[PDB]
Amino acid sequence: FAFVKIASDGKGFTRYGEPYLIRGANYWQGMNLGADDCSGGDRKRMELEIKQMAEMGINNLRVMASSEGPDDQPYRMRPSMMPQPGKYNEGVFVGLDYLLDTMDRYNMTAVMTLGNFWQWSGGFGQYVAWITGNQTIPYPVGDVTYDEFTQFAARFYNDSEIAPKANKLFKDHIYTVQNRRNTVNGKIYKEDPVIMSWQIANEPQEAPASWFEEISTFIKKGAPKHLVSAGLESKLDEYDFDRAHDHKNIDYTTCHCWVENWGIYDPADPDGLPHANEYMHDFLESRSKWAAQLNKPIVMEAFGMARDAWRNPEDETYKYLPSTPTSHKDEYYQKAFNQIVSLASNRSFSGSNFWAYGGEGRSTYPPNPYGMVWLGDPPHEPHGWYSVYSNDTTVQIIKDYNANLLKVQKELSK
Template sequence: MKLLTLALALTLTLTGRDISEAAPHHGHDSAGYVKVAEDGKGFTRNGEPYLIRGANYWQGMNLGADECSGGDRHRLEKEMKLLVNMGINNLRVMASVEGPDDQPVRIRPSLMYAPGEYNEGVFQGLDYLLDAMGRHGLTAVMTLNNYWQWSGGFAQYVAWIDKNQTAYPFPSENEGWDEFTKYSARFYNDTEIYEEAQSMWRKHIETVISRRNTINGKIYRDDPVIMSWQLANEPQEGPLSWFEETSAFIKDLAPNHLVSAGLESKLDQYDFNRAHTPKDIDYTTCHLWVENWEIYDPSNESSIEDAMTYADDYVHSRAQWAAELNKPIVMEEFGMARDAWIKPGDEDFKYDPETPTAHKDRYYKGIFDNIVTLAKKGQFSGSNFWAYAGLGRATDYPNQYGMVWVADPPHEKRGWYSVYDKDTTVKVIEDYNAQLKALEEK
């Protein structure tokens, strides 16, 4: 142990870091941590208002890995600067990817390729990402699981326990989803496997929260770069007891950090309250997907009007639900395809990086305008658009693991919801972020 301590101290000395700063003791003061405001109407950081000017950047952990593990740190560093230039202050990222790595339509390489077995190269990618975010003044929402198959998620835990299931169901583009969702929900609905599944997952949660960053020496639970630990991406209709017990478990491990549910809040207010009422769920979330929910047709030019009307009602209704719980709300996912209505007979047109984004730009602005209006009243706390592809392109050649790091998960067609560094959408995002920043400074 003494040799390990000496080695860490030497490493930090060589990189110009003070180990007394890099690894603070658990339970130190709250400087730098994002907190819920005392009146429940928003967030603060260092005693000042903190509005979420965010993006989804789920691929950040994998980009932060070394080249042998499929990463690209040079690109990640460039994208950090681009994000800061856009006014971004928060990234929602994955802190969990389950293997095995021979399964299709999922992130490869995985973080945990077998129960309790980790790819250290990928884990160091998460270390590198958090360190880079700290250097650039960003905070992180750390997603600890996934209802969907593209990162392994709930279904992979079920598959590990169900010895007769060699691979969980993979829904095709338009069929098989009912079968898959029932299978995935066994993670917290099947009494026969519940204890084993939760125990296995809690070991992962504890491993991540207690990890010491190999880049800067900070223990994750003590790192103010982490704003929130999120139970899962879009846990569909999970039991109240699961939200209560898991959020309490996380809060006990990381009392300086916030905890969020990751709910899309698509259903009714009862579903919203079930996920967000527990005392250790610090704030509420919602996601908005007008094409996936068959409200918007990208090949129909007039369909944008339906999308705008729906989004307006959605933002206001979810804000009201959050107000009734006296908790902040963040719109942490929303997106729109490129302008397929220009060539309605060409299905691939909406995925082409060169296709314009007139509808997307108008849609983003409409959502942003609603959020700014509500934020002025203390009724909304920001957003994370889906998602930032940065320097990547749907047309890029896959790496050695078959991955193309854009903003669309590997089960979706590349380019569907990606925001590239050269898109006109970037200016819409910049203007919105400037408005939120101005509100913080009032």
């Protein structure tokens, strides 16, 4: 009965008739960790990580509710949820069940990401490979560039021959997830108040408005009780933002911020932090204006920063070691957080999900028998790049932010 909703003034969420602020984290590996041992999970570790996240004041996990095989491909989650179109690894699906049940035990809500533009869960590029029947995806390594790969995966919604077939497969997947019976608590996912929203995909890259319209309407019809979200970075201009978010069945807006990936921040520069702080600040103000123009909420649902590489810039390994401090990352988080708490108390921002909780995982630990080093960084990126570990100094900063935002949520209730 406890479904997350949009406030009637459209400026925030509500739960139980009261304002609801997103004290969130990214936990995309939750499904795989929740699996039984036999499918490469570590359920006790997953229960421990959700418990840790509860102690840090987290009320919301953005999770991954898709991943595509075949299981021989590099740079992606293994074992996948859907190794072939319409065929599922039941062991991985049960992990999604346990993830939702454990989140249930902790009164947390989930953002369910139903696909992925990028290679790390197979994603749109894998659907394209399925349709064209050519499994040699142009992964962005060696001589192949990110926009060669982008142009390939975008065929998913841009190619008038591939798109109808790719989307038929994608919709079969959306349906399968929304109609899943949780094998642990008996709930069908579309009627599970633990799920806050269905999210079309991780980071659609210049997708057409008609595609956002068609997919949001499919997801809403499939689960009329649930909010729907686009998964957009909002890294371009206000029109790009509107193309994704200006749709009756897109309920709130998101943004992602990646300073290093985008060339704004150089983690190996002891002097490099101010560029990143300034960028983030202008980023939050402007995206906040974009949301308010649609009279829709906004969550910064993924943002990250590297460890202090600058303390030893000549050594590439040092940047990924857990023992490396995170003084830049902690400042950057804290300034982002303080600005979000400030905007939220003005009814102009709804919270955030740091990218990403690594928990007990560690970038120094050996891969499991499936070749996975589970933590917050997906397998197309260096292990340990962005992960927040259970005992990093960044935890106190997240914990403080969740308390601050919860204070704000109480002040908007009275």
